[PDB]
Amino acid sequence: KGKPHCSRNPVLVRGIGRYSRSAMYSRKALYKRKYAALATVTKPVGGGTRVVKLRKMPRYYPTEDVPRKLLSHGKKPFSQHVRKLRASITPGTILIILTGRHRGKRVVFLKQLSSGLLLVTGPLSLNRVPLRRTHQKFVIATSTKIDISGVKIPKHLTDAYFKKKKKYEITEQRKVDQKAVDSQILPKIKAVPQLQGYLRSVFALTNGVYPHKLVF
């Protein structure tokens, strides 16, 4: 028994401890922490009893096999990957969707979801886009923000909620959660003037427009 105290020394730089191993001996106080020195489960049967084995041997062997691999270290599965946000992607930043069906549409960013996909909502009243996911590298984070400091996004909408089950029909849950969240964002966009019509408008490249000069 013993409650695990979180790492006694902080991290100065990645892989480097703040305190050396003389400091750390005193920090952990080891001067008063010194130490000295299944297979076949039986079954009753209606001329005696029998000994069965859960995990009993295979009935078929293939004519040729592949051997086991070598062992590597830094090869994590996707669930355990460290997730980045680009610094400009601030919850409330007005993105420009670039790739899919809703390309060129300006859309309010809500929050970074658990899998690194941006949960994003251009209000369905304005843009005709739902509570939809997007990717960071397929948007443009504009220098246009509104204060989303207070309002509570439902927690049950997550990366498992948005996954395609397998024509598609909009559930009543989706429509309630849409007008639930959007009822709290619409007064924030209708506060700052000319901003609802700006979201309703579509981004495009003109003649004499080069993106390397425009601040957006």
Binding site: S88, A141, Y210, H212
Partner: protein, 109 residues
């Protein structure tokens, strides 16, 4: 509604003088005329869009006649704002002096 790609004139091949290397392509993106104006376009996706005789399936809807060779801006090339790109199969030489599309969507803004 409107356009979502900068216009790159395919200038010609990566080459010396008496020896051209067809694996790399030299792009001239319109507007950008320096090496300190072409940091934005490094890593972006490029498309040589053309149309040919037969029908070829389209990702998103109906089989059309239109076709693509997807590329990728790798480097800046020389002092006056040209760009090295590299395509999944080598570009055809009939395309020299023709339009290809610089996309935005390995986006860094």
């Amino acid at each position: 509604s409107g356009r979502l790609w900068c216009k790159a004139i395919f200038a010609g091949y990566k080459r010396g003088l008496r020896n051209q290397r067809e694996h790399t392509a030299l792009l001239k993106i319109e507007g950008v005329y320096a090496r300190d104006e072409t940091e934005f376009y490094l890593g972006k996706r490029c498309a040589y869009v053309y149309k040919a005789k037969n029908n070829t399936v389209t990702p998103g809807g109906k089989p059309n006649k239109t076709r693509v060779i997807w590329g990728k801006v790798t480097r800046a090339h020389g002092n006056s704002g040209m760009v090295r790109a590299k395509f999944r199969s080598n570009l055809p030489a009939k395309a020299i002096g023709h339009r290809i599309r610089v996309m935005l969507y390995p986006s860094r803004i």
